[PDB]
């Protein structure tokens, strides 16, 4: 009967954490810093999806073309299979044409 | 699993409380008790 017999340990949450108190700063660095930077030069993540949004077929095609040369070998073979699967799904299957 | 269902004990007990006075396995096991509670309703 998967429900816990004791109530879980308490969630303290620091609303005035340094991450939360300064969240949002320099999100507007372009429009009031004479446009020397874009706000997408603040985003920090994988090198292939900085300032770029796409679905899973657009993402794996872009990750392969940008970072596939230095990807691990059993991890690259999963990417080519995934692109070959999401090609077949997005181009051949679905309710709408 | 990102989010799974924790409230499922309380959803079983909305249907099992209406079946508590039944006979056999239709008061305990939810899968039989939901078809009799519906038919009783």
């Amino acid at each position: 009967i998967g429900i816990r017999l004791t109530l879980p340990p308490p969630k303290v949450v620091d609303r005035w954490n340094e991450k939360r108190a300064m969240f949002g700063v320099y999100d507007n660095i372009g429009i009031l810093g004479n446009f020397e930077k874009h706000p997408k030069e603040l985003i920090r993540g994988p090198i292939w999806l900085r300032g770029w949004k796409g679905n899973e077929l657009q993402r794996c095609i872009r990750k392969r073309k940008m970072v596939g040369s230095r990807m691990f070998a059993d991890d690259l073979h999963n990417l080519n299979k995934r692109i070959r699967y999401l090609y077949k799904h997005f181009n051949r299957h679905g309710k709408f044409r | 699993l990102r989010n799974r269902v924790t409230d499922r004990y309380f959803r079983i007990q909305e249907v099992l409380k209406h079946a508590r006075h039944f006979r056999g396995r239709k008061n305990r096991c939810y899968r039989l008790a939901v078809r009799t509670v519906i038919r009783a309703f």
């Binding site: 429900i3 816990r4 017999l5 004791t6 109530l7 | 799974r4 924790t6 409230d7 004990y9 309380f10």
Partner: peptide
């Protein structure tokens, strides 16, 4: 261990009700 507070809070208050249907106070 499924995370979350609210079901564990409901179930804690529905076991107190069972504590009063087994051990009711004078």
């Amino acid at each position: 261990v499924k995370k979350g507070f609210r079901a564990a809070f409901r179930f804690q208050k529905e076991l107190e009700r069972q504590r009063l249907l087994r051990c009711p106070p004078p």
